[PDB]
Amino acid sequence: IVEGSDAEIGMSPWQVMLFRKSPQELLCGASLISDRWVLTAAHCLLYPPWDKNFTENDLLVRIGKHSRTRYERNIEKISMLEKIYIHPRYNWRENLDRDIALMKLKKPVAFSDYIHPVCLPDRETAASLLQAGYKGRVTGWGNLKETPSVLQVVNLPIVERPVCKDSTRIRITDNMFCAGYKPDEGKRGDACEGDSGGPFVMKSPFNNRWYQMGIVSWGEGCDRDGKYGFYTHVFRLKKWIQKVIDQFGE
């Protein structure tokens, strides 16, 4: 996160850390949508252009965390991965279209002050909230600059599709949105590398629940004027989410 601030404790209790076993390495963000299911970006698991194809056994999920590095004794919880699911139409070659993945946790987690799940938006909520100029929130333990001791946060405006589109030569897609400030706006902030899989969330003024609307997906540099962060449009992809999540018995 660039130009962000230290989160408060329990501020983002659905924050999930995607962690490589060996070498021990923090690799992405992710978010908790139930005791059992974690959402991240597909590129965090599978990205051929860079010979990345992680299997379940390569990775850990660390949940309830605040410190980036420090083990958090009766706070953080660790699960192995039962099964990874990448969207079937994830387009790593072109533009990280449908940059989304689910991870089913081997060891479901107990909710606490530090571990609680985020909501996924229904249609009405996505249409109401995912509107240009409305602000959402990104969190991660990602880089503070392109060139963090503690989880990072920043709120930022959704950008209109045309500004997003002319910001980049990468073919933009309806399963993405972008966000961040326009140069004339006089405020900064962005996700950056290692924030991916992390939640872009919005607090419904209607029921006061947090809804995850996007997933930190990509950008070009970080916090660059006239650039915006790109986000996997969670709701555009909720059909797949539902299908994978609804398949098994409790």
């Binding site: 949508i33 909501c119 959402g136 709120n155 003024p205």
Partner: peptide, 28 residues
């Protein structure tokens, strides 16, 4: 997940976080 998006340390305790209001006014 019927309790989703209500944070034990904020909503649940009727405390607001530091920067939450920014999101709320963005809707105006």
């Amino acid at each position: 997940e019927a309790d989703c998006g209500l944070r034990p340390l904020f909503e649940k305790k009727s405390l607001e976080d530091k920067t939450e209001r920014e999101l709320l006014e963005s809707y105006i």
